[PDB]
Amino acid sequence: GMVFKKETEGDVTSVKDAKIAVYSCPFDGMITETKGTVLIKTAEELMNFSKGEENLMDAQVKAIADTGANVVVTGGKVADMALHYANKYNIMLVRLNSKWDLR
Amino acid sequence: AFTELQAKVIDTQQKVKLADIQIEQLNRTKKHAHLTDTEIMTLVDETNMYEGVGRMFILQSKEAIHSQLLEKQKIAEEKIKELEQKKSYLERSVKEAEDNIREMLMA
Amino acid sequence: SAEQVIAGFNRLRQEQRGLASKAAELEMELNEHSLVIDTLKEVDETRKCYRMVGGVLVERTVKEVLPALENNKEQIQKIIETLTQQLQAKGKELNEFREKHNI
């Protein structure tokens, strides 16, 4: 059966009979640099964008848990805020995947 | 040569586009002057009625204001005849001349 | 042929811009009907209310000004739905006549 070299992140699937959700990039990771006017005027909207980002990936692992899939395949990188809700939801995660892994 | 007679009927087309839009105003000004006459012929309670053109509103009795507002719809009623006769005339001028243009260039 | 499909979709998009001017023109007026009917009810209505627009003042009372306020607000929200349905129905009609013509 299918052998994936990529390191298993989070706990194991809830069932071995799980529905396999294969996604190109559901989870992200944030870093930025100087803008059109360099280094934007506040850090409050940086905190305001960071709060909805966690509740976004909270609901992403939740809606996969609601729809029946107990494993998510991430061709993009793993978010930290996505990760600690995925452990409680008992859904297995792949940290990263290449072009051949998804196809 | 034949280039000059092409541009004459093309310049006549944009005069029709000016003629088409004048009738849309003058039909609206007749009915709106009729519409304001209905609302003052609606009330019977008060003869007090203000008319004006700017932001002035003079105090007059309403009955003399009706007959003037009867004349307001009527002049706008008078102009839709002369424009539509004109608009048809400029339409007949360009379109019948357009029959001359294309069939003898393609010939 | 595929040119009758890709050009007919351009025809439906241009009617979405022809839909765009008429409905939003009425939509700016209903919010003016919103702000007027609230200030009249809060202020004293025992003294007689008039109707002042550009060029005419007809000497009225509160009982004749009040119902047309609620009437002209309700007429606008019906037409902006009505103007949406008619122009979007027109985009459906021109597509099938282009497909039956150049076949």
Add this chain to the structure above:
Amino acid sequence: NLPQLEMLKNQLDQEVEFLSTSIAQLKVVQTKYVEAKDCLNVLNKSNEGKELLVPLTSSMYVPGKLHDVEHVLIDVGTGYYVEKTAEDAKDFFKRKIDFLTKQMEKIQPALQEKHAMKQAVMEMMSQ
């Protein structure tokens, strides 16, 4: 030939719209000149004494009584007070109406010149 004309027809489109907007501005200027005569027509005919609601300021009206209908202010110059009678005031309004018409009349074939030249570029690219 053709790449020059595709740049050329796009330039004349702005030049129509820049002139036609200037036509639209000057019609507003002569609009109040028509409007001031028609206010003045009611003034001499009615009488002195009638009550008017005039703008104290924006959207605020003050009542008042009407007197001396045969003497009016005309605002000409750079913003200067000119007292005239009401009879000479009608002549100067219609003079300014024909003046603003004259300001648009010098633009008007040149407005049509920028339109007809753009159409000729559309024909020369087509021919």
Add this chain to the structure above:
Amino acid sequence: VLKKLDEQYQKYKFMELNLAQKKRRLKGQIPEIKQTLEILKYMQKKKESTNSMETRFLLADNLYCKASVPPTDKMCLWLGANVMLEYDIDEAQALLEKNLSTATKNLDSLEEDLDFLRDQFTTTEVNMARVY
């Protein structure tokens, strides 16, 4: 790297135009409410300013008729949308002062928050680009 810098330059510039559509509507409200207070607070009424005064009425924008004023003591203000109510000085005064104070603060409190809503839009579009 300058390549990450170049993408954030264009995404910052395009979001400036969406702010200027909202500030100018906030700008257009301010002088109109400004004319209401200063003309009223200087004349204060025919009543409060001690009977018959002078006037040159606004019939049009260039045609002013000179007359003697004396009205009765009311002001028929204009609300809009087929509504005129007759008012007095005390009702018309405290209302417009409240609309005077807010229209500055509607311009002031938003123009900072629009500058950070632009900064939300430029920051959001670049982090998704670097990941996927």
